[PDB]
Amino acid sequence: MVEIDPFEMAVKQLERAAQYMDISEEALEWLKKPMRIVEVSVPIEMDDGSVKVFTGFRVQHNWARGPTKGGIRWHPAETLSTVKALATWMTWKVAVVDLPYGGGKGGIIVNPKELSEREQERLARAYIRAVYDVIGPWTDIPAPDVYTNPKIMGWMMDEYETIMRRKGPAFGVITGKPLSIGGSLGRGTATAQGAIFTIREAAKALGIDLKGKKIAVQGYGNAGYYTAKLAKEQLGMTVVAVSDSRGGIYNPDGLDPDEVLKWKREHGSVKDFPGATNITNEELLELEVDVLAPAAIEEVITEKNADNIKAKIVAEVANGPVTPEADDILREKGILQIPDFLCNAGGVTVSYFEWVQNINGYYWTEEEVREKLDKKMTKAFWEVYNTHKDKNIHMRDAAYVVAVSRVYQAMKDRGWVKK
Ligand SMILES: NC(=O)c1ccc[n+]([C@@H]2O[C@H](COP(=O)([O-])OP(=O)(O)OC[C@H]3O[C@@H](n4cnc5c(N)ncnc54)[C@H](OP(=O)(O)O)[C@@H]3O)[C@@H](O)[C@H]2O)c1
Ligand SMILES: N[C@@H](CCC(=O)O)C(=O)O
């Protein structure tokens, strides 16, 4: 259902942004192709006793800066191109906030809503058994993503530890784990906290007081719900509309995120929430708000609605929710955009913190994680902002100049590319 191919779009963005920097042709060709792709068959036993084979992908795009990092997406509409694009974005995501990581991603073409608990556990364990040879605490560190949660992360960690015979830091093979089995404090609200920090910095740059303003959030998952909650709590914002895959609810007077979450859990969706009006995702994206945070499937803003966006700041919590064309239209409209791999870099940052805690065997507190995350996100955002201001270019491009250059430097320090 995607407007354009995700990997093609990602490559187009990379070229469009490399047009504003000095990079050799060979380095560009290296960066336009994932470094390793592994397609595996994942066989599991269903509840009725039959054996079903799913398709799994583990794509690492580059590991010049360090071990690759990226979540695992469970999605019926997933394609290898989507995983390649996500790994490519992961690379820039970890480069922009200066982490010793490369870019990676994983996925399974499956509808998890049609799978039971035992089937989900079997699927996670079989995926680990399939991709064990390309993952590790120093090779490839998976994490939670769309339709995956810390539960599945703990199952995957247990399977990896069983295969690995407890020879090294198995806890560090995967992030977003439960706190009991080597989890990190603040990882649950990581991406939301990073998005909130970036929104606050953007408002500071734009000279806008966020108290009493309006935020519309698309998607009510681990990122969308926590983003709405933190915006209502920390920034003093008024959440006027939320949504999920079945539709959204809008309220001019504001919504309480906890009640909406309870209604969603007790009914399966946020639709027909009391005191709110049912709308579509297309209608929510077009609402008159001060901040719009897409936290759902990619490619939600295209030439079919780019001119209808009326938000002062668009916080791309999701991975690649805006097309380059739509980026040009929004920039022509004077709308500030927080780039996708900079806005939601808080999640990968706290995942890096969890990995450090796991490999060192020493765990931090909430305050330390909160301070380090704030420091990293503020530095990265201000670097990207000053970059886009000095060169008079789009935000997305500027972050690329901040990110790709670092990656480029790594290759020149490894001898991968001579020029
Ligand atoms: N997961 C992470 O740790 C993390 C960290 C940083 C960034 N991100 C990015 O943020 C995005 C959201 O991830 P997540 O962890 O929030 O996923 P999630 O919590 O597992 O679920 C995503 C939510 O979005 C809704 N949704 C799914 N498809 C949609 C569509 N086509 N239109 C509108 N809404 C839709 C779903 O509603 P239903 O409940 O009705 O299905 C679901 O509640 C992802 O694209 C991811 O790349 C994720
Ligand atoms: N934004 C990344 C971060 C995941 C991680 O912690 O590695 C994703 O979920 O795709």
Swiss-Prot record:
CDD domains: NAD_bind_1_Glu_DH. Belongs to the Glu/Leu/Phe/Val dehydrogenases family. InterPro entries: Aminoacid_DH-like_N_sf, GLPV_dehydrogenases, Glu/Leu/Phe/Val/Trp_DH, Glu/Leu/Phe/Val/Trp_DH_C, Glu/Leu/Phe/Val/Trp_DH_dimer, Glu/Leu/Phe/Val_DH_AS, Glu_DH, NAD(P)-bd_dom_sf. Keywords: NAD, NADP, Oxidoreductase. Its EC number is 1.4.1.3. One of its GO terms (biological process) is glutamate catabolic process. NAD(+) binds at residues 219-225. It catalyses: L-glutamate + NAD(+) + H2O = 2-oxoglutarate + NH4(+) + NADH + H(+); L-glutamate + NADP(+) + H2O = 2-oxoglutarate + NH4(+) + NADPH + H(+). SMART domains: ELFV_dehydrog (SM00839). Homohexamer. It holds the Pfam family ELFV_dehydrog_N. The active site is at 105. GO terms for molecular function: glutamate dehydrogenase (NAD+) activity; glutamate dehydrogenase (NADP+) activity. This is Glutamate dehydrogenase. NCBIfam families: GdhA_Arch (NF040817).
